[PDB]
């Protein structure tokens, strides 16, 4: 949604010169982005949103 | 400031790698500082070399 997201606002992708496929970056760490960039705001803001929306999941799912 | 950047390329860079730049001031020409630079990457092999022409900030010389 967020790889959409890039292609549907004007000039998102300069912003996001290192992409934004997280699946990669965790599936395999030698792929990762450095750490520097990813504190960037554009990239870090919406992440950190899917982090507390996890969170939820881990919670609801474990509860049933 | 910088006034002339030159940069050798010793050997190529592959995506995602991490370059590790050491910087040096090495010398002057009349108020000019040389920078000198070494690129190299994980498996410690040069990279990137090169001279920086950068003056000195605004100087004013005041006599006792």
Known sequence: TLSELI?????????????????????????????????????????????????????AKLLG | RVRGYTCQFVDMVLPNTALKTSIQHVGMINGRKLIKFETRNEDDVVVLTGEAEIEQPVTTFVFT
């Open chain 1, 7 to 59: 292609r549907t606002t004007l000039d998102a992708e300069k912003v996001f010169t290192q992409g934004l496929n997280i699946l990669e970056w965790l599936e395999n760490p030698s792929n990762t982005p450095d750490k520097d960039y990813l504190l960037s705001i554009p990239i870090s803001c919406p992440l950190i949103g899917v982090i507390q929306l996890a969170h939820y999941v881990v919670t």
